[PDB]
Structures are given as C-alpha cells and as structure tokens.
Design a protein around this ligand. Structure first.
Ligand SMILES: Nc1ncnc2c1ncn2[C@@H]1O[C@@H]2COP(=O)(O)O[C@H]2[C@H]1O
Ligand SMILES: Nc1ncnc2c1ncn2[C@@H]1O[C@@H]2COP(=O)(O)O[C@H]2[C@H]1O
Lengths: 627, 150
C-alpha cells in the first residue's frame, strides 16, 4: 500500500489506481470532491513520509510548489516574530494559498511529532485538477481564532481579517520587479486608503517599524540576509504608497510625520551600511483656490440672541467644544452654552460637543449661534441671511452663455481638486471618528446648492415677463454648455434650479419660451430620471472620458448606502469586502480627475454669487410674479 | 411598476430600513451602484427612492417627491427633533406634484431600544402609524405593504 503510493505517478498500474481510489474515499479532506476528480488524483497523489520530529516541509518566503493533506501526525505553523501560530492535525490540509495566489509561503510548516505521513499534490497537477473545484475558504488561524479569511471572487482575495494580519498579508505579497509597479500599487491601494477606518496611524506606524526590523528565524546566513533585505524593500514600498496617498495631509498628523522623519533616517543609515535601496532612498527623500487644512485658522463669527457677535480664532478642524470654549473666553462666562446652526428660514439645529469642523457644514446662508438652552426656541434669523432683494441680470445678461459656463467649470475644477480622496472616507464614516476636516468636500458640495439657488433667485427677482423668458432660455444654454465641458454637477444644478417649485409654477414664462428650448429642457429633465438606480445619468457619465465633474449628490448617496448597507466588522474581523467597495467609489473620483481641464468680469461674478436659499421667500416672490 | 419614497431627518433609519427591505443587512453584501439596488418584486415591482445621505441637497428630495407615489415619513423615537421635522415634509409633498391627496404613512423607527426613549406612541398616533425597528426587523416589510395598497 505504502509502496503503491511511493511509486512515481507514471508508474502506476490500473489495479494500483483502483486500490488508491478506494482509499481516497475514506479521506475526509477529499470528500467534497467529485468521483471524476478523485480518480484523476489517484494517478497524481504522492505519499510523503518523515520520521524525525522537527523536520521542515517548507519555509516562509519560499515558492508555493505543493498542497498537503495530513494522514498521520501533526504539524506546527511557524511565522517569524510569533513562533508557532497554530498546529494542524490528522485530516487537515495546508499549502493551498501560496499555490493558487502564486505568492510566497506566509508561514513555515514543521513536523510537530515523530513519524508523519502526508499526501502531496504538486503545482501543475493541482492547477489542472483542483484549481477551480477545490474552492474551500482559506481560513488562517492564530491561537484558535480566525485571523484572515480569503475566497475566490481566479485568485483568493481577503474577505475579512485582523488589522495586523491584513497588513502582514499585503506586505508579503508585494512584488518588487519594476515591470509590476502598477499592479503592486493597485493591490496595496485598498489597504493604504482604507486603513484609517480599522488601523489608524497610532497603530500602523509602530507596526511598520516592527516589520522593517523583523528578522528571519530560519536559514543560512545568506538566505537570512536576503530575506531581511527584501522584507525591508517591501516595507519601504508600502511606506511610499502610504506617504503618497496622504500627500500634504501628513502635516496634520504628528505621529505620522514623526514616524516618516525617523523612518527616512533609518533607511538612509541602512542604505549606506547595507549598500542597498539605491532606487527607493531618493523617492523617500522627495517626500520629506488651495486646499483648506485642518490646522489652518479661521476668523469665524458666532452670534448671540440679540444679533451681536463674537469673532473667534480657532483651527478649521476645531470641535464644537473647542468653539464653545473660545466663545466663553471672549464673553468671559461659564454659563452652559450650546452651539446652534440656523437657516435663513429659521430652522435650528443643536450641535453636539463631539462634532468637529462645523463651519463649512452650514447652509449657504446659515449662521452659527451661542446661547443657553432656554434661548433656543426664541432665536430668530439675521437680516444678512435673507439674501439679495434686487437681481443681477443687468450684469450677467451682458455675458456669453459660453463664457459663463466655462468660468463656472474652471471654478468648479479648482474646488473639486481641493477635495482629497480621504475626505470622502472621513465624511462617510463620520468626522468625529477621525477628528479630521472635510472642509474642502463641504464647500464643493455646498456649491451644488449655490448654483441651484442662484437660478431660482434670479428668476424670482426678474419681474419683466419678457426678460424672464430670456432668463430661462439663458440658463438652459448655460446648462447645455456645462454638459459639453463634462461638468455634470453644475449641469444638474441648473436643471434642478429650473425644476424648483418656484420656477416650475411660472406657466406664463414656460409657455412663452420657444419650443426649441422646451424640448432641450425636457431631455435634460429625463437625464434626471431616478428610475432603475438613476440609469439615465449613470449611462451618460460612463460614456464620458476622464476629465469630468460627476453628479455629486449621487456619489454621496452611493457612499452612504455602502456604509449603512454593510457592516464594518464581521465576527470581530475587519470586513475587507466593504473596505474595497468604499475604495472603488473613491477611485472613480480619482479617474474623473486623471486628466487636466482645457474675461475677469465673468470670473468675478461666477465666484461671488449672492443667493436666496430661503424657499418660503422664493415661493412668495414667485406668487406675486404670477398669481 | 411602483416608486416609493423614504423621507425624514438624518440619523433616523431611512437607509437601514431601505436596505433591510430590498435585501437585508449582513446576509448579503449591499451594492448601491447597480441597477437592481433599490428594486424589489413583491405581485408587483417596487423602487425605493431614499433621501438618506442627500438630505443637504434639497433638489434631490424634490426630484424624488415628483417621481414618488408612496411616502414614508420616518422618525426616531429616541429623538424629539425628528418628530417636529415631519410637518414640513408632509407639506412639501403637496407642492412638487401639486395635488390635495397623496398616499403616505407615518413611521416610528428604533422602537426596540426603550431605555433611551423620549418620544411616545401617543404623539405619533395623534398625527397610518407603525412603530417599526430596522435593526430588529420589526414591521420593515409592513411599511412598504401599506403604500402599494394605497
Ligand atoms: N522551518 C522553521 N521556520 C521557522 N522557525 C523554525 C523552523 N524550524 C525551527 N524553527 C525555530 O522555532 C522557533 C519558533 O519561534 P521563533 O519564530 O521565535 O524562532 C523559531 C526557530 O528558532
Ligand atoms: N495564521 C496563518 N498564517 C499563515 N499560514 C497559515 C496560518 N494558519 C494556517 N496556515 C497554513 O500554513 C500554510 C503556509 O503556507 P500557505 O500560505 O501556502 O498556506 C498556509 C495555511 O495552509
């Protein structure tokens, strides 16, 4: 029997094969496989035996060349820097992951006891027989806990895992070969971007240092020297990707800057001494409207009930509690203050001490108030908040529709490029959880409302019906030119401004509009059809090439539902399936900005819009234009 | 073919309810970027148009209000604020499509937790009424059943 299985695959008789197959039916590790598959394995499965305990089947870092099943005995799964991570027993299988992902061995396998028997299947045999049929989930275990979970979604990808093991996985799988620069960065990008949710810098940085200085516990001197050197090369690669992702945002993180500054010293010292990192050291040396920073300071006005105000000087990323404190300093009081946002329409919201960077989360005409709780219901809006009372048609009517739309898209692009990829992550998972600002996103998202209300304001302040028809005509043109420049955001903003109840009511204006522009708008309104998950817009945006501004409210919707529809943690492990989904959405924004974009009087108007955002006021103005 | 709209303030449970109805949390991953994300056959097809995540964009709710046929005015029973925010939304529906009568339902979400309760059953009843819970899957399906009847 042992002899039969010890024979080379090509030297097995028909009767030998029949005997082997019958035995394979008793092996429970193979029971999920078919009859067809099992008899193919009969002429391929190699019986391996080792007598000495402590014998090494394979080492960490080596190429995956075999899959094993334990017939008799047990093995230690050994990882550098943590020793025996778990033990596998009779009936267990190992070695699948490295083989299928064509990745290095993540661990060593060492014989736990004397006299062990194994069934082995080599790589080319595994790939033609078992590759797409042995689809068992790979569950890496440490201390009888799941630590990494991988599945076929064709290679195995991380579904869930601990922050530490996820990092260990993405480190080991880095390929340093220059021809794989793009592929390596793409694989790391999910972790690099999404780590702030599950493994913040306060943990990640110490971990990166530990890995950089990690040494192998096995091998000849040269074997060990080479492993450690490449381990160091991989950690530098990840740090470079990590540093690139943050960019200017590192300045906001003292822990991250301290780490990077010291990491550079480590690497430069090691480069000199080991005669290595010739390509990577210079890259790391480089790293050691304008986007608003969280450390930047604002002079913000906080209003009392009698409409007097305090000017405070605080960081942009200041918490509500920090704002309350700054107000209490200048008013010289300790009498239970709350911060409340107020609309032009009188609608009030109490802010929580927890909330950070609230200044840019106000409405277009919103103001910030400080008062004791007893005053909350008596608060009334400032006259400043109610917007203009006479139009500006006399100014922008004299301006080309093409010039207006162009200066809009120019300004929209400056605002859109100020938004950092990470601000989308911070906004979705909640600002307080990161204590970071999303001021750039806040202001760019506000701009959609600004444009929308600009339209409604100018129409409602235009009393001459003849000129009001000329207005509707002009906005439709501005919208059409925006859709041409691929600024879909401003396009939809104008369209939705026209769709506003105050504007859609004006039948005598719409009827007197040429049917050429009536049909234009009806087509514009159909591009807004929420039917089949905004299919009308989604197909439109898909057709377009890189340099484009997407429909922002829909992006914010996608992000919100990805977050609420999926759990962050599954079985106390990071749901990395969710992490990828969020990262994909952010990369779509990256794709929209992958290419650049191709009259000071028009510029100044477009960038200094004065708007009514009070719907009640706009409805009342509309009603006395056309009763 | 039907189009139901979910309305209410932020942090109420609009999105949780939406996902819990059309598919369910945890049991399957939720992808909100595909065609079928908000459509569920029930014996007729329903699209749920939810204003969750887009509350700051007033134009978004209006667009949904225009295309809507059924309306869910959801409020948290741990928040006094959310109940008082409903009167305005009720009115805004009767303006975009321009009528007198519109099929709708009041919804009191988060009923499972009552050690943080501040609103009562009393008040909602005074204003169709359901005390549902998205996370505990109480009345989740019922909410959207009443609307197709109306
Ligand atoms: N093949 C092997 N791979 C890794 N460690 C091994 C191997 N064989 C023996 N060992 C030893 O087992 C030890 C387990 O803990 P360490 O990883 O600290 O250090 C390890 C080595 O000294
Ligand atoms: N926590 C773990 N980390 C790495 N490998 C593990 C772990 N637990 C079990 N193993 C097994 O040990 C094998 C080492 O090589 P592979 O990465 O090919 O596949 C691995 C798994 O089959």
């Amino acid at each position: 029997m042992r002899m039969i299985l010890r024979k080379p695959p090509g030297q097995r008789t028909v009767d030998d094969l029949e005997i082997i197959y019958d035995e394979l039916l008793h092996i429970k590790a193979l029971s999920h496989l078919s009859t067809t598959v099992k008899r193919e394995l009969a002429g391929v499965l190699i019986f391996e035996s080792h007598a000495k305990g402590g014998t090494v089947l394979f080492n960490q870092g080596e190429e995956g060349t075999s899959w094993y099943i334990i017939l008799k005995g047990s093995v230690n799964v050994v990882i550098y820097g943590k020793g025996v991570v778990c033990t596998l027993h009779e009936g267990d299988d190992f070695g699948k992951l490295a083989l299928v992902n064509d990745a290095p061995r993540a661990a060593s396998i060492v014989l736990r006891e004397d006299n062990c028997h194994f069934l082995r299947v080599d790589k080319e045999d595994f790939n033609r027989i078992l590759r797409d049929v042995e689809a068992n989930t790979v569950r890496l275990k440490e201390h009888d806990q799941d630590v990494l979970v991988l599945e076929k979604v064709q290679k195995y990808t991380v579904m869930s895992g601990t922050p530490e093991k996820i990092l260990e996985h993405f480190l080991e799988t880095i390929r340093l070969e220059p021809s794989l620069n793009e592929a390596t960065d793409s694989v790391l990008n999910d972790f690099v971007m999404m780590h702030c949710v599950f493994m913040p810098n306060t943990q990640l940085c110490p971990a990166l240092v530990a890995h950089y200085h990690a040494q192998p516990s096995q091998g000849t001197e040269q074997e060990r020297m080479d492993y450690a050197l490449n381990n160091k090369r991989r950690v530098i690669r990840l740090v470079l990707q990590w540093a690139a992702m943050y960019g200017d945002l590192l300045q906001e993180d003292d822990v991250a800057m301290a780490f990077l500054e010291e990491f550079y010293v480590s690497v430069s010292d090691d480069a000199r001494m080991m005669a290595a990192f010739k390509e990577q050291l210079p890259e790391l040396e480089k790293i050691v409207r304008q986007p608003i920073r969280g450390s930047d300071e604002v002079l913000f006005k906080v209003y009392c009930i009698d409409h007097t105000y305090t000017t405070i000087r605080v960081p942009v990323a200041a918490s509500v509690k920090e704002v309350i404190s700054a107000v209490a300093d200048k008013l010289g009081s300790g009498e239970g203050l709350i911060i409340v946002k107020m609309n032009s329409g009188g609608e009030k919201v109490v802010l929580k001490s927890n909330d950070v960077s609230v200044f840019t989360t106000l409405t277009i005409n919103g103001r910030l108030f400080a008062c004791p709780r007893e005053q909350f219901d008596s608060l009334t809006p400032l006259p400043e908040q109610e917007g203009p009372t006479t139009g500006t048609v006399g100014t922008f009517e004299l301006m080309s529709s093409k010039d207006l739309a162009y200066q809009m898209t120019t300004y929209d692009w400056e605002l859109f490029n100020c938004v950092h990829e990470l601000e989308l992550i911070y906004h979705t998972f909640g600002r307080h959880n990161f204590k970071k600002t999303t001021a750039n996103l806040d202001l760019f998202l506000r701009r959609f409302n600004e444009i929308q209300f600009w339209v409604v304001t100018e129409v409602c302040l235009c009393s001459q019906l003849s000129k009001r028809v000329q207005l509707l005509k002009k906005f439709i043109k501005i919208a059409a030119h925006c859709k041409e420049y691929k600024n879909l955001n401003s396009f939809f903003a104008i369209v939705m401004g026209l769709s506003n109840v105050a504007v859609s009511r004006l039948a005598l204006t719409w009827e007197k509009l040429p049917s050429k522009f009536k049909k234009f708008y009806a087509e514009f309104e159909s591009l807004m059809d929420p039917s089949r998950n905004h299919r009308a817009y989604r197909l439109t945006a898909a057709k377009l090439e890189p340099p484009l501004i997407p429909f922002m409210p829909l992006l914010i919707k996608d992000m919100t539902f990805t977050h609420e529809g999926n759990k962050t943690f599954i079985d106390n492990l990071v749901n990395f399936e969710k992490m990828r989904m969020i990262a994909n959405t952010a990369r779509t924004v990256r794709y929209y900005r992958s290419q650049p974009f191709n009259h000071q009087d028009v510029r100044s108007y477009v960038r200094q819009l004065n708007v009514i955002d009070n719907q009640r006021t706009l409805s009342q103005m509309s009603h006395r234009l056309e009763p | 073919e039907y189009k139901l709209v979910v309305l209410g303030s932020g942090g109420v449970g609009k999105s949780a309810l939406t996902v819990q109805f059309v598919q369910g949390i945890f049991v399957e991953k939720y992808d909100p970027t595909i065609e079928d994300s908000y459509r569920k056959q029930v014996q007729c097809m329903l699209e749920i148009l939810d204003t969750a995540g887009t509350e700051q964009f007033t134009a978004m709710r209006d667009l949904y209000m225009k295309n809507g046929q059924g309306f869910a005015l959801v409020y948290s029973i741990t928040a006094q604020s959310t109940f008082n925010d409903l009167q305005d939304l009720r009115e805004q529906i009767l303006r975009v499509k321009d009528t007198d009568d519109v099929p709708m339902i009041l919804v009191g979400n988060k009923c499972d937790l009552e050690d943080e309760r501040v609103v009562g059953k009393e008040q909602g009843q005074n204003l169709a009424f359901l005390e549902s819970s998205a996370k505990s899957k109480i009345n989740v399906n019922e909410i959207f059943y009443d609307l197709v009847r109306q």
